[PDB]
Each structure stands twice: as structure tokens, then as C-alpha cells.
Amino acid sequence: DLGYTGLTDEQAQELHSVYMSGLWLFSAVAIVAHLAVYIWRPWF
Amino acid sequence: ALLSFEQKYRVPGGTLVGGNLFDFWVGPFYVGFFGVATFFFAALGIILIAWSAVLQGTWNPQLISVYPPALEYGLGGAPLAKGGLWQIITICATGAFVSWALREVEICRKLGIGYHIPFAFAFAILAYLTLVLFRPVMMGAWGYAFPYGIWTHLDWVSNTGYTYGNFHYNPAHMIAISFFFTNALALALHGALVLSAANPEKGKEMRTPDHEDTFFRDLVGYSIGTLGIHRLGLLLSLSAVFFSALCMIITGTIWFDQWVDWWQWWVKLPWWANIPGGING
């Protein structure tokens, strides 16, 4: 078979695209937060 | 009331004492020779506790305490204001408990079922008698028993435990605590499993004992069974009470020191007695 979960290749690729959009959003916000904290009070 | 199925079960017979003299019901309760005895003993005990409260000078239920005789009285009678009321109330309590067990035996005989319930109640009665009768008699004074107060019998527990340091180090106490904890855990698991089988996810059919066996086999790899769990519960409770009675009957009669010092026998075993290192080296 092509997989265990029962998702078409196209379904999986679309879901991965949306997942990576969400991941990049979260990571951009986290990067900005870390930059702000490091400027305010560096830990190195 | 009467249950819808009660009427066919209310038949004469099954009485140890009294025949048909007391073979009847008051409301839902079954009265017998031992029912009448239970009522008399319980009423006398409760009324005498109220009179002890009158003598003591408090009406706060949490401050009322009936104290046993002083150590100076030994095993003899004491004035009712000092410890005589405690002795009469203890006799009344023993009579009430034993008559309750015998009334349960009569009800078991009438219903044609086993005598497991009176037998299991006899264990609690024996633990109570260990605390009020056997241990004080062995020790030589009624004053080693506990008072009849809501918070003063906790004072007795604390004082008796700290006579021997930390009481956690009594080994039969450890076994009894393990049994009590395991019993509470098993009760939770059994209630939860039966309820989860009988009350599935909404809209689903009732689950079978196969699903219960499957669920604990999936969880822990073993299922004791529908009969096994009830046997296990009976034995866990009775073992906990038995080992409690044992740890209290050995305390102050064959062990008189700090219970923490008892465990030095294992540490001082000849082969590892003197090896340096660790905690005791």
C-alpha cells in the first residue's frame, strides 16, 4: 500500500504545506521573542 | 415498604435463637433475638456517652471524650465518673457488635446465602477487641485502651505510636499499610472497570466481561477475573485488619523500644556487619 493512515499523496502534501505554514509562523514569532529577550537581557 | 421483589423472600425460619418470638421486620429492618439485643446495647451505649458528656461539662460533639480508667486501677473497676462509664460503654459496644454479627448470620440463613459478611465483620470486631480488651489485659491496665472521643482517640493513637519513636518502623504496620493501600487501589480499579463496561461511550452497547478482561490485559498484561477481584478484595481487607491487630498486639508486650532499632538486626548480620561504606558503615 501507499501508507498506513489512509491519506492520498496529494492529501498528505497539502496537509504538510499547511503544517509547515503554521510551523514557520510559530518559529518566526519565537525568533522575534528570543531576539527581544536577548537584547533586553542576554544569557551569554 | 417492600422492594418490588421482596415479598417472596420474607419467610419464617433461619433464626439461631428465639424461634418466631422476634421473627419479624420493623420497616426494612429485620428484628431477631440479636436485633433486640443490638438495640438495647446501642441505646445504652449512646445514652451513657451522653451522660458522660454531661459529667465532663461539654456539649461540643468534637470535644466529648469518654476516658478509660487510670493506670492505677489496673484491670479492676473504676468509678463511673473516672473510668467506669468507659467500661460499661465498652461492654455495650462489644455486645452491639457481636449481636450485629449474629443478626447478620440469621439474615444470611434466612436468605440462603453464604456467611462471608459476618465472618468479615468478625475481623473488625477482633481488631476492636485487640485495641480495647486483649492488649490492655496483656499490658495489665484498662488505661492502655483508647478513649471514646472524636479527636481524643487520635490523641491516643499519636501517644501510643510515639511511645516507640516513629511507628512507621513496625514491620507488621508496614504490611498492614501496604494491604490498606492496595485495597483502596483495587476498589478504585474494580468500580471503574465495572462502570466503564456498563456505561460505554454514549450510543454504544453494553460491554461484556470479555471487554473488561481485554482492557486490563491491554493495560497491565494480567486480568484477575470477576470472581478473582471480589476474592482479592475480601482477602486484602481482611489481611490489612489482621496485620493491624498483630502489629498492635506485639507492641508493648514483646517490643518495648523504638521500632527503628528493630531493623538493625538486618544491618548487623555477621557477613556484612562490618563492611565499610554505605549508610551504616
Partner: protein, 54 residues
């Protein structure tokens, strides 16, 4: 790689998303708790010391 998208053809999306949500929540709470437990990074105490509030 350019072919990670097939991880979704192996694992159930619901379980993966729930696992990530729980893991991220607990990781964030854990890091914030460590920072609060560190006196040099407790921002409430830093502001109290900076603005003379106690």
C-alpha cells in the same frame, strides 16, 4: 529533504497534532517555570528592583 510530506502518509494527523500541542505546551510551561525560578531572570522581581516597588 523535499519529501518529508509523506510523514503524514505514515502517522495519523490527529495523533501527531495532539502530541505536538501537548509537547509544546509542556515545554513552554517548563521553560517559563525555570526562568521564574531563576532569581536573575524573574521579570517581576527584576521590575520590582528596577522601579523600587518593595
Amino acid at each position: 529533504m523535499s519529501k518529508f510530506y509523506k510523514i503524514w502518509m505514515i502517522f495519523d494527523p490527529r495523533r501527531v497534532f495532539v502530541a505536538q500541542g501537548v509537547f509544546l505546551f509542556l515545554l513552554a510551561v517548563m521553560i517559563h517555570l525555570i526562568l521564574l525560578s531563576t532569581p536573575s531572570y524573574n521579570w517581576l522581581e527584576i521590575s520590582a528592583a528596577k522601579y523600587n516597588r518593595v
